[PDB]
Design a protein around this nucleic acid. Structure first.
Ligand SMILES: CN[C@@H]1[C@@H](O)[C@@H](O[C@@H]2[C@@H](O)[C@H](O[C@H]3O[C@H]([C@@H](C)O)[C@@H](O)[C@H](O)[C@H]3N)[C@@H](N)C[C@H]2N)OC[C@]1(C)O
Lengths: 292, 172, 159, 72
RNA sequence: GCGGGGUGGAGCAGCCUGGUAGCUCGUCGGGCUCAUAACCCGAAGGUCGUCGGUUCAAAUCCGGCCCCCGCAACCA
RNA sequence: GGUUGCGGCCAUAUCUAGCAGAAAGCACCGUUCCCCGUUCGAUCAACCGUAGUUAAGCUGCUAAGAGCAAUACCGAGUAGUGUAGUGGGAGACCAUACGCGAAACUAUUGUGCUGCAAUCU
RNA sequence: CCUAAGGGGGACUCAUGGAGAACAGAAAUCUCCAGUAGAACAAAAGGGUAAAAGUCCCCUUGAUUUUGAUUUUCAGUGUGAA
RNA sequence: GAGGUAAAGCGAAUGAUUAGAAGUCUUGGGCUUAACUUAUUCUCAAACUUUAAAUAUGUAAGAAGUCCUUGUUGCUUAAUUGAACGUGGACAAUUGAAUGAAGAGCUUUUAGUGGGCCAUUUUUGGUAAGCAGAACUGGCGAUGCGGGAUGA
């Protein structure tokens, strides 16, 4: 009774979206506004903090855009945190702060801005932008890129923001999306934010769930029990991690159990082959013959 | 593994939506909102008319109906009370092609709601939405996609699941 | 009456190409323009700001000014018995580098390289381009290529 | 038919010709080509017109459509 | 080249300014008279010429068509 | 070579129907004290990586597949067109000389390439 | 003609069709699926636009101040507009 | 580089349009007239279009250029990054296609004119017109001369 919609004209006149738009990964509106540079600032690139959250990892890459593709300046991953003393909760707000701090420190170390622009060592949770030093280089300026993730107050992307800003990068931002902002009274509750930086909310959950349902605590916090880390022992974990990151932020790759040749050799055993023309023709001819 | 017996293909209720389309506003729509708020334990939301029909005594952007969506244990409890009121009696017509179904109740007081002359009697509509694990891929913001054909729900499998789990009859 | 508005007669010139609608690919915004570059003007119908007039659509000029989001291009326009220098502000979506210039710079580089080679080698090289000359003499074999005779064919109808 | 078209010519302005076509009916094939297609089972009736075999597309559908086709 | 109209059965309003179709006569039911007329008590009847558009909403505003009525068509 | 994050060009990348996927990654997946958002913890927010699964997403393979792309003794030097004649023809129009030159149609082939960074049985 | 129908941000996806749900039927409301825009964007027509330029929500007044450069119409005068 | 006219196309979008065939009756009058769907079929568009010429059209082919080193700045960069203009050094007649060039450039001042008309091609209104109106070019007007008998 109704027309068959999937016609060959519908497919012929269909304009496919950009490949990364149809994978639902790039917002090109936001990307245009982020990347485009003042034309009187001729070849000086704009820099982005890409912050991406998978189910098990946190990615922080400092990226500048080019015609043939984006170029990574430095990158930091949450799976590097076991080297700095954080083993569990690698998608926390606190791990997010640690990753931001790590990428900021690695960037400043690679750029030579270590002695100048140390950052904020005595972390108290106060909104603070990195300020330039007189008669000297301006701070490394990057712009936060959260991609498709929604802006909410108390979101982990702004935890990475806070870490990168405290590492000494200059990242423009306002404090009204940190955990602790009061909309009715527009001030930042700095104690609550500093609690979030040092894992305090996780420790509060540990205390409450131990006092209420020790079986649920047993299941959820099993890793902490195995290491016998109690709720009082978390702030030191994150503080020691911050100290270790600030002491040595150099990148160390995970040593490869095989080289690229072995890796390519092993996976090719599980790639299917394309049929050649002779083979598809043979299949067609046999399918005609069998049909009688 | 490529198996249909996998634990991730098991059907279950996504949501129940309670619908009362009283055709107008006033004390009737307020009362219907109150009865939904009691039955669901959740505040319901009014729906406006999308345009004006003089046969229906209805006006564009004028409050008429009220609905609430319910999911979780509450959804299945209200579902089984509704099927009791139906006496576990549904038809193959009730089941949609995609794999949902619903029915109609002429009185909430049949479900076990204490009768109140302040509120009275209101007919109601039930509609459950089926689904499997991984329906998030069509709902999330990032990397949204579609569900593969063998994972999709459908009429026949939903009738099977209903007859099995609820031990009812689907009068074909 | 007659109508001579700003965008009159631009029904097709300002349309987007077939299956080329929508967002601008970011390579447009990453190109770098300098004063003295030669650029081609092409109005993009989806960017209503900083557009050329229809006269400058398809013209080529010199960049003389660079601002936040746009360049200033110098065009020569015939008005009666002389040209007038025109100055147009164009957002970078409507502008593109000209390719013939990059080819000419390639030739300048190659020519310097060749002259340096000849200098350091003790000979002289002629560096002016030349138009195609008449062909020289040649001898054609008939090995496997005996001349084949063709004749005009008779009229036929195919109705 | 030629005489019928001859009479109808007088109703028009200008000059017109009556041409006998080499082709089979209203089809775009010569008589011999239509016979050669017919004997290979590549044509079916579509009422007043016919349909021709395409060696492109879904093989099973094409083979159902023209059961008499003699693949060579 | 024009300007005015089309609305219960009839003649007429409501159009100007979009939200309920009004007046007189007429029709139908009952009463009064031996019956009629007058009179008395009650009821029906036009989607507004048609085809569309605009609008939340059209008899109402706009366009095309049909039927009606008339105005004007001069200087040689 | 697989995979992920950010991309460039933006269907050879799309679409339909089947099949297969080791490791890692990605993913689905559990939970609601906390920041946060909803009629609804479905989306969004946070927490656990702990209880489960390659079912789906994703990737690759298949189809005389649809679409797309490319090529050609394909049609066709055809349609059209610049220049010329005191060319032809009542005329509509047509040929010739010096030049340019399609689209449909027909046939065959192909079905992403790639930059940076990290990671992997 | 518009205090938004101007400015910024966010979230969402439109016309239409199919299959379902008491009253409820072709048109009331709810659910899912398909859907390149076949909708919408004050007003003519054309162009443009889909994680938007459309719809909804939040905050606003850049519809502000100072005078210069430029484009169209063009005499390269004015006015209007940009 | 730009273009959307000629041509072409419509079993490609929009709009127009001839004929059957097969399905769905669930959609309406009475074995089926009609709608609808599917694959076909004939014919079209100044205010339709995927494609798309020929002619016409924009720009470049260096000395005001290229290369090396490093000066200025209150602009710009995280920066010793750049931007613009430079100092000093290198490249000299093939100084970077052809053909031509009673030379190039600059200024003042003032006349007449501001009814046009014709021919080939393109083209609009009109039955058409030695009619009315546009485009490019060449002419007549302003021009005699040989030819078309005669004739802007
Ligand atoms: C290919 N297209 C052609 C186009 O080339 C042109 O053709 C002319 C033609 O019209 C000329 O012919 C024209 O002019 C001559 C005479 C006055 O010169 C007349 O005799 C003739 O009637 C007239 N048609 C002919 N002499 C040259 C072709 N190139 O004009 C006609 C056309 C069909 O458009």
């Amino acid at each position: 009774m109704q027309k068959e919609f999937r016609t060959s004209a519908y497919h012929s006149r269909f304009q496919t979206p950009f490949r990364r738009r149809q994978e639902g990964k790039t917002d090109y509106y936001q990307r245009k506004r982020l990347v485009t540079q003042h034309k009187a600032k001729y070849n000086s690139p704009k820099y982005r903090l890409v912050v991406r959250f998978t189910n098990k990892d946190i990615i922080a890459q400092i990226v500048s855009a080019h015609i043939t593709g984006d170029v990574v300046f430095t990158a930091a991953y949450a799976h590097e945190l076991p080297r700095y003393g954080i083993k569990y909760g690698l998608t926390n707000w606190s791990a997010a702060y640690a990753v931001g701090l790590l990428v900021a420190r690695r960037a400043l170390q690679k750029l030579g801005l270590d002695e100048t622009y140390t950052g904020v060592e005595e972390v108290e949770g106060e909104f603070e932008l990195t300020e330039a030093v007189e008669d000297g280089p301006r701070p490394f300026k990057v712009f936060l890129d959260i991609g498709l993730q929604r802006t909410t107050t108390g979101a982990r992307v702004f935890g990475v923001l806070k870490g990168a800003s405290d590492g000494g990068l200059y990242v423009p931002h306002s404090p009204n999306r940190f955990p602790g902002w009061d909309i009715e009274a527009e001030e930042l509750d700095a104690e609550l934010l500093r609690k979030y930086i040092f894992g305090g909310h996780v420790a509060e959950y540990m205390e409450e769930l131990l006092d209420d349902d020790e079986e649920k605590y047993k299941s959820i916090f099993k890793n902490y029990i195995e290491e016998e880390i109690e709720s009082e022992d978390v702030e030191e974990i994150y503080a020691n991690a911050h100290e270790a990151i600030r002491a040595d932020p150099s990148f160390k790759p995970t040593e490869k159990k095989f080289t690229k040749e072995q890796y390519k050799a092993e996976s090719k055993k599980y790639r299917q082959q394309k049929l050649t023309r002779a083979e598809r023709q043979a299949k067609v001819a046999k399918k005609i013959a069998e049909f009688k | 593994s490529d198996k249909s017996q996998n634990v991730m293909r098991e059907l279950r209720i996504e949501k129940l939506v309670l619908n009362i389309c009283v055709g107008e506003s006033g004390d009737r729509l307020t009362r219907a909102a109150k009865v939904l708020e009691q039955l669901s334990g959740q505040t319901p939301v009014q729906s406006k008319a999308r345009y004006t029909v003089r046969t229906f005594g209805i006006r564009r952007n004028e409050k008429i109906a009220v609905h609430v969506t319910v999911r979780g244990p509450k959804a299945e409890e209200i579902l089984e009370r509704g099927l009791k009121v139906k006496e576990y009696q549904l038809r193959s017509k009730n089941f949609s092609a995609t794999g949902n179904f619903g029915f109609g109740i002429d009185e909430h007081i049949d479900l076990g709601i204490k009768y109140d002359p302040s509120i009275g009697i209101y007919g109601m509509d039930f509609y459950v939405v089926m689904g499997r694990a991984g329906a998030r891929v069509t709902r999330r913001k990032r990397a949204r996609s579609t569900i593969g054909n063998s994972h999709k729900t459908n009429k026949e499998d939903t009738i099977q699941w209903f007859k099995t789990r609820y031990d009812a009859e689907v009068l074909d | 009456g007659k109508s001579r508005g700003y965008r009159s007669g631009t029904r097709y010139a300002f349309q987007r190409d077939f299956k080329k609608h929508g967002a601008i690919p970011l390579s447009t915004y990453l190109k770098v323009y300098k004063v003295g570059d030669i650029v081609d003007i092409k109005a993009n119908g989806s960017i209503q700001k900083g557009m050329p007039h229809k006269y400058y659509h398809g013209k080529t000029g010199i960049v003389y000014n660079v601002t936040k989001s746009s360049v200033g291009v110098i065009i020569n326009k015939v008005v009666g018995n002389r040209y007038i220098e025109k100055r147009v502000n164009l957002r970078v979506e409507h502008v593109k580098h000209s390719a013939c210039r990059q080819e000419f710079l390639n030739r300048v580089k190659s020519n310097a390289a060749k002259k340096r080679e000849a200098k350091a080698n003790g000979e002289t090289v002629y560096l002016k381009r030349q138009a195609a000359k008449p062909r020289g003499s040649r001898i054609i074999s008939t090995e496997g290529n005996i001349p084949q005779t063709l004749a005009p064919v008779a009229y036929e109808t195919f109705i | 038919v030629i005489e019928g078209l001859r009479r109808a010519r007088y109703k028009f302005p200008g000059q017109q010709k009556i041409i006998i076509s080499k082709k089979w009916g209203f089809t775009p094939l010569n008589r011999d080509e239509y016979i050669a297609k017919k004997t290979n089972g590549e044509v079916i009736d579509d009422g007043a017109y016919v349909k021709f075999l395409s060696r492109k597309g879904n093989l099973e559908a094409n083979l159902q459509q023209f059961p008499n086709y003699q693949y060579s």
